[PDB]
Subunit: 221 residues, 3 copies
């Protein structure tokens, strides 16, 4: 369904070119990983970089994943910079329901991110307020890793929860997604796919990798 | 003496072009302001952006100003990414002498940053171990601001301390530096000048602004 | 004057034996470095170990150096466990004067610890309330290190301050103190000497090292 390349793997010296080209190559969203050196042991890119992409002319959805703690102060800055989706980790907010409301009140689409160990019942009382749930299939902020197999089982659980809600909620997956496992991940229930190194560091073009990913997703459904 | 444009004001969609052009226009260093959303209320750019500039072919000194707390974990990442100078705020480290030693042990040039209110006696026992002292003439992380006049008096104090040490220590200034005040700032003792919006958002070219700054500095000495 | 071996370097499988033997060998105090994994990146020993030495029959002064933050909660536990001196880092307490008063109110002797970079003016308004000032000549919590030469100059400054106060205040030194530099350190003004590896990991007996240290201090005064 939706392909959302992570730009952590792109050439940050020519970020506008990279984003322009990956969207032309078939990507739907720009996935924007924000790390504050506290919630995870790395520091990446803040609102000014999102704003720069909008000023450069990017009109595709920008999907901002906040690996930061606390989260509320920076959310208005990402809204002002032109974020489309803003997702966050419930452990990183003292008032999860308020953080969701804040994102929505600014005109952005709120998402919740589940770390690999995070139990699904944190969705019990907020799921209907969400536009997106992201399951991490690697540990965020710890670099290039292999897909964690239990994410396939957790995807099936959250897919059932979203389907039972009757709401249009994206089910996103991030971590070690590549051409040769995206079919199984789609069959498990994901419909929004974040890939970084598999696209930006491929031996073939961005368009070839994205086309293979789509073909593999279509064949598995 | 040295011109160190802050890339926070540059076009981050074409960062390599901006840096290439500002260096061609007469800049000496790339000044790299790193904010972690905790030490200051903003989040900017991390080690991956420094690495990207090195991979792009930038060979000029990269001057990394850490507005982060704590500081020690990220310092090796900036060293590996190709930082030349790494400066930090002593308030942000529990063991200032160790943090300096760490920077030096990685082959980088350590600096200490004094916020506008920070008394100079934090230099008492570390000055001889430094390659750079940076005085902030705006409050860091709070945006485009006007030069704080007390910075001129503090520059004179720190110039005397550096001169009395006999060591080769840069005296850097950052905040609201522009063509029409850089002469007075140089006369107060600074020899390394950080400017952001005055260069990257100027109504004339980067080369014109930098040439005026140099002429104004030369006329004031 | 006073020798205070640091038991961090002792054999913790036979701590009572080690402490008994080093006091029998001529040591005056038991120096007790307490690290909470937060103020420094290591965790050592808490009040229960102090209590075990008292229960074992140790009657010499136990000199507790708190490298912990915050400090007030654990101070009554060290007093109850039989600490004699309790020293702490002013940076680790939000109310340095109160922390001193708390130590004194429990019948213990309060000390202030200066890290290598810490300016001496933190002593300005509390020095008369202290029984001890400790200068760190290594970075605390970062392991076996070499004596930082600037500690000799800071000892001379703090020696003058204590002498001008007219109060009986110990001037303690900790970090890389060994037989071949203890003379110079004493000449700089220290009268209370913490050594760890030089005593407990020495190639000669405790009684020989302590006698050599004492002879070297006497010859330097
Ligand atoms: Cl709200
Ligand atoms: Cl986890
Ligand atoms: Cl990462
Ligand atoms: Cl080190
Ligand atoms: Cl300030
Ligand atoms: Cl800012
Ligand atoms: Cl009290
Ligand atoms: Cl220090
Ligand atoms: Cl240690
Ligand atoms: Mg539960
Ligand atoms: Zn992400
Ligand atoms: Zn700066
Ligand atoms: Zn100690």
């Amino acid at each position: 369904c939706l392909i959302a390349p992570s730009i952590l793997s792109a050439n940050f010296a020519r970020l506008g070119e990279e984003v322009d080209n990956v969207l032309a190559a078939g990507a739907d969203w720009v996935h924007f990983d924000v790390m504050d050196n506290h919630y995870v042991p790395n520091l990446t890119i803040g609102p000014m970089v999102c704003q720069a992409l909008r000023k450069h002319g990017v009109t595709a959805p920008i999907d901002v994943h906040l690996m930061v703690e606390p989260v509320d102060r920076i959310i208005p800055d990402f809204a002002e910079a032109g974020a489309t989706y803003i997702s966050f980790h419930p452990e990183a907010s003292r008032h999860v329901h308020r953080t969701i409301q804040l994102i929505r009140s600014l005109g952005c689409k709120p998402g919740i991110v589940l770390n690999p160990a995070t139990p699904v019942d944190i969705l019990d009382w907020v799921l209907d307020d969400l536009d997106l749930v992201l399951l991490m299939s690697v540990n965020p902020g710890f670099g290039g890793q292999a897909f964690i197999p239990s994410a396939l089982d957790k995807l099936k659980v959250v897919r059932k929860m979203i389907d039972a809600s009757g709401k249009d909620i994206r089910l996103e997956i991030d971590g070690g997604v590549k051409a040769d496992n995206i079919g199984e991940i789609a069959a498990a229930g994901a419909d929004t796919f974040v890939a970084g190194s598999a696209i930006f560091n491929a031996k073939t073009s961005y368009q070839d990798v994205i086309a293979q990913m789509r073909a593999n997703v279509a064949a598995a459904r």
